[PDB]
Amino acid sequence: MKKLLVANRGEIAVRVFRACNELGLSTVAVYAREDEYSVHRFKADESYLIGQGKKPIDAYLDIDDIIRVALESGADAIHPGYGLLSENLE
Amino acid sequence: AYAGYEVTPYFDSLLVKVCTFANEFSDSVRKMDRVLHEFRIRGVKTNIPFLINVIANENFTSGQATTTFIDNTPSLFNFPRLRDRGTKTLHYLSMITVNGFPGIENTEKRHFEEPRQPLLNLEKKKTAKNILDEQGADAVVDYVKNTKEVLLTDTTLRDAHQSLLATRLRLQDMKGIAQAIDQGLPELFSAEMWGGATFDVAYRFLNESPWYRLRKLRKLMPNTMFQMLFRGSNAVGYQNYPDNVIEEFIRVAAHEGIDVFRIFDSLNWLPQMEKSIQAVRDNGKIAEATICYTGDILDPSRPKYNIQYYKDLAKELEATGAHILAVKDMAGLLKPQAAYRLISELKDTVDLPIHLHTHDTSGNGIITYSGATQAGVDIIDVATASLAGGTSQPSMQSIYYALEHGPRHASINVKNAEQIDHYWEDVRKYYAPFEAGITSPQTEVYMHEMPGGQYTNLKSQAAAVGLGHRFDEIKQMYRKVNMMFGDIIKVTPSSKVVGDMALFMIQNDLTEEDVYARGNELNFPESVVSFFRGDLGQPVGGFPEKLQKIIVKDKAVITDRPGLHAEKVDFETVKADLEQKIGYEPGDHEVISYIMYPQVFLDYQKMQREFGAVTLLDTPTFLHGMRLNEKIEVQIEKGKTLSIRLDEIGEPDLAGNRVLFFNLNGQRREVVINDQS
Amino acid sequence: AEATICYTGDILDPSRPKYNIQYYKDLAKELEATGAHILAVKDMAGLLKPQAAYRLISELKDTVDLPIHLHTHDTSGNGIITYSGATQAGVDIIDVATASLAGGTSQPSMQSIYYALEHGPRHASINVKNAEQIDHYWEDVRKYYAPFEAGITSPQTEVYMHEMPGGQYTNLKSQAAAVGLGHRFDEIKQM
Numbered sequence A: 001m002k003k004l005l006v007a008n009r010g011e012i013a014v015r016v017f018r019a020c021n022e023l024g025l026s027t028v029a030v031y032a033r034e035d036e037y038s039v040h041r042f043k044a045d046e047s048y049l050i051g052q053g054k055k056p057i058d059a060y061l062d063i064d065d066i067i068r069v070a071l072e073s074g075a076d077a078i079h080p081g082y083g084l085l086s087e088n089l090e
Numbered sequence B: 001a002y003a004g005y006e007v008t009p010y011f012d013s014l015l016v017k018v019c020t021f022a023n024e025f026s027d028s029v030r031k032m033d034r035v036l037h038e039f040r041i042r043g044v045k046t047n048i049p050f051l052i053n054v055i056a057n058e059n060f061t062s063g064q065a066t067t068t069f070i071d072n073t074p075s076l077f078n079f080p081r082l083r084d085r086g087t088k089t090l091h092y093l094s095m096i097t098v099n100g101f102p103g104i105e106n107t108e109k110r111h112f113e114e115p116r117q118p119l120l121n122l123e124k125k126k127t128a129k130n131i132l133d134e135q136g137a138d139a140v141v142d143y144v145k146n147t148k149e150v151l152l153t154d155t156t157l158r159d160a161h162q163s164l165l166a167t168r169l170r171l172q173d174m175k176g177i178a179q180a181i182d183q184g185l186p187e188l189f190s191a192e193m194w195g196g197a198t199f200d201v202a203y204r205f206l207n208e209s210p211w212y213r214l215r216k217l218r219k220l221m222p223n224t225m226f227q228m229l230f231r232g233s234n235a236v237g238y239q240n241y242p243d244n245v246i247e248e249f250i251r252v253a254a255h256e257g258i259d260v261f262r263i264f265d266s267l268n269w270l271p272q273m274e275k276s277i278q279a280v281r282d283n284g285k286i287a288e289a290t291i292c293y294t295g296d297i298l299d300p301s302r303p304k305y306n307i308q309y310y311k312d313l314a315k316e317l318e319a320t321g322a323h324i325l326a327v328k329d330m331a332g333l334l335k336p337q338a339a340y341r342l343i344s345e346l347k348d349t350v351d352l353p354i355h356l357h358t359h360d361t362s363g364n365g366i367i368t369y370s371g372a373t374q375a376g377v378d379i380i381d382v383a384t385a386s387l388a389g390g391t392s393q394p395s396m397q398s399i400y401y402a403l404e405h406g407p408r409h410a411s412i413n414v415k416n417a418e419q420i421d422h423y424w425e426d427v428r429k430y431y432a433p434f435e436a437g438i439t440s441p442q443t444e445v446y447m448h449e450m451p452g453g454q455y456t457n458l459k460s461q462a463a464a465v466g467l468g469h470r471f472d473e474i475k476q477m478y479r480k481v482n483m484m485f486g487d488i489i490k491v492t493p494s495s496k497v498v499g500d501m502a503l504f505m506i507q508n509d510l511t512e513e514d515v516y517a518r519g520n521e522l523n524f525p526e527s528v529v530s531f532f533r534g535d536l537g538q539p540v541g542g543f544p545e546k547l548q549k550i551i552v553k554d555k556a557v558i559t560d561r562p563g564l565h566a567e568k569v570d571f572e573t574v575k576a577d578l579e580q581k582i583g584y585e586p587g588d589h590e591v592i593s594y595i596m597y598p599q600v601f602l603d604y605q606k607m608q609r610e611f612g613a614v615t616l617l618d619t620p621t622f623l624h625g626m627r628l629n630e631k632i633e634v635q636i637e638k639g640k641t642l643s644i645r646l647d648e649i650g651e652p653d654l655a656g657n658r659v660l661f662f663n664l665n666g667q668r669r670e671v672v673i674n675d676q677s
Numbered sequence C: 001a002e003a004t005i006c007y008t009g010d011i012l013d014p015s016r017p018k019y020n021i022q023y024y025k026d027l028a029k030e031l032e033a034t035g036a037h038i039l040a041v042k043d044m045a046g047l048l049k050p051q052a053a054y055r056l057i058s059e060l061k062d063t064v065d066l067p068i069h070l071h072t073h074d075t076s077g078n079g080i081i082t083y084s085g086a087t088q089a090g091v092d093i094i095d096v097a098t099a100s101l102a103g104g105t106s107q108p109s110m111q112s113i114y115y116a117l118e119h120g121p122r123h124a125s126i127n128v129k130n131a132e133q134i135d136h137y138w139e140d141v142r143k144y145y146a147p148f149e150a151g152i153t154s155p156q157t158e159v160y161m162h163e164m165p166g167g168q169y170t171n172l173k174s175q176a177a178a179v180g181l182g183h184r185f186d187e188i189k190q191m
């Protein structure tokens, strides 16, 4: 495991990046347009727009687009965080 | 330690005490490491670099350090050159937003649309590049010889914008369409994308490394042969380098992505081309030996550069083991009749493909290429339409339609090209300041033979000496001077020689007679002397003898290859010497850039240190800074981007400083910049 | 009296048969019949590619005995070669502008066409030295007209796709901006 994507935002995304960083993992963050000024976006080693054109909450729920990013980024893992997709089976 | 706080010299230095804590001391370390790395304190230097090293160290992490551990560990004081890209960019943006860009009126920044991305219809094809890589240079020559169509080289990334926008085309604009070229126009023989003025101008004026340009394009255009113009003796420079340098340049260039080396010499003097040709061969690459065209073969009164001259030279060049013969018509003097006779007779004379290069200054470029394609020319040089015409190359899109139903077609995906030309149409608008103004066909070039660059630079020189009003007489003198010196091949840098001389003569009110009479009591321009000392090599048919003595005087004339006389050069000596001057270990390409253009390479490094990778800015930004309330995103890596809003521009204080108020990534940022007026 | 045929389409494009080579020949006959002194071919949009120019001037010369006066525009970049093709097919007269007011959507250069045919079978009848001198005056004078200049002009082959003459293109770019569609001019050309 070299790299991790947090399928979330804000405090908990930053929480995880920290944990990652301490375990020598590279980080990847995802962000809606509406959230473009969120701290968590810039606290990661690299960050990628998602949900383009959608409503902002829908974007953090766009399962496919997240994984698209997870893959084009090179991520070995995904941390879901809490709320959003973290409890979602699909 | 807060945003805006003036750190004074009076009190101690402490900004903030950071503790970490954890069950396992190993994890207390992990957290400290994260935090130190997490901190973003801008405005003043801090000791963080030092602390990071110290917690990295195994003596510390073991819990065993002593009081002398630090003073006895020299490793702790090697600090990574810190890259603050946010900061340096904002410095640049501020500099330009207030003092404007150098050598262009400080206008206000237009709103520009996204330039048009092309709708392409792709077709998979093997490409000369593919062949070269898989089967070598001779295999490509075979591929060319077995091609029916006239094959095209795209001069859009080099000679086109050199001819039209003073070489100011920028990588950022290039990389936005590079891929579309590679996939949309596989039919191409090569893309001319390096050499010529691009090498110094990229460093000197655009503050981007030509090497960087090459690297970044080479990844984007994996199936397109990359071609460069290359001066036989001097590669991309104007000093007199020894042979080991030239070989070295070539090794590196070859390695870094260049496939096709058009090698020429300003006086078509074979000895300057010989080593370089071999060198290119030796690196497994294609070598175009080139003849420069001057005069008019169908003009019996200019017999010096008659049809025989070219045939004989072509033989000699075939003999060097060049893969391809190139005819570089610098000034667009090849009329279409002559093009048909010349390409015809050269094809009779030698078996290597002929690559023709002209300029559409006279209005006769397309018809000249047409003639030449009837006479069997293998390859021709074209620019996309939007950067074509006038003193550029003839239109790629036009030459397709010109030969459409003819015996020989042009090999190119014209639909795809027309789509790509939309992007170039748009992008060229960013370069308005460098545009040369109203351009129409001009046949006077047949009278004076100045290449497009020489004409630009002599209009400059004339205005800066207040003779801009008598430029008509200056052009006439250029013609007289050329004849006075025995009728010579005028390309860079022999073109400047005639240039400088014709200015000097007008400026000081002397005719041809006046030179032959009172030459000894006159100091002729440096260039003119170097030429006649043989520092440029040996002109066709040698110099006029009386005039040589007069111009040279006491000085030491050579008559062999100036590279033999070149100050011997050591790569280790210079590499070490440079490492000290820039403060890191330079790659082989930096070394060689330094050898080629020493001053310019160092100035480029100051600019880099002060301003960063300006390369990454959109061109309107790069040239005009920002507008109040404007927002921009600058991509720096994949997934890292600087969002930059500008919110206010302060009035200046008494020291002539202003404070610009940006939001970079959701942080206020105050930036002080010297207003210079 | 020059009776004139206006050129449109592409005679060498079999899918545009309406204005094929026959169309022109037949019209030329009819016009010869009216007692016109001269046949004129007015290529308003600069659509005459040079192969087509040779076939067309050729077949018309085979059809009628009155001199042919050809007029094209250098918008596509192919005006001079088109005139060259046409002069090989025997065209009697061609329309040119002095170099300083030539090119782009103007006519092909008078000075350039001389040099284009210089050592060819058929020369252009003009005093080119004198023309080059005169072109200086026009060079200078055009500067007075800077406000009306149309901006950076380069070759454009899209004219073959849409067939707008230079004036129509200018006036439709106007009309489009004044109805705030200037941004969608690409769609307008398609329509």
Ligand SMILES: [Mn+2]
Pocket: B159, B329, B330, B357
């Ligand atoms: Mn050139």
Ligand SMILES: [Mn+2]
Pocket: C043, C044
């Ligand atoms: Mn008209």
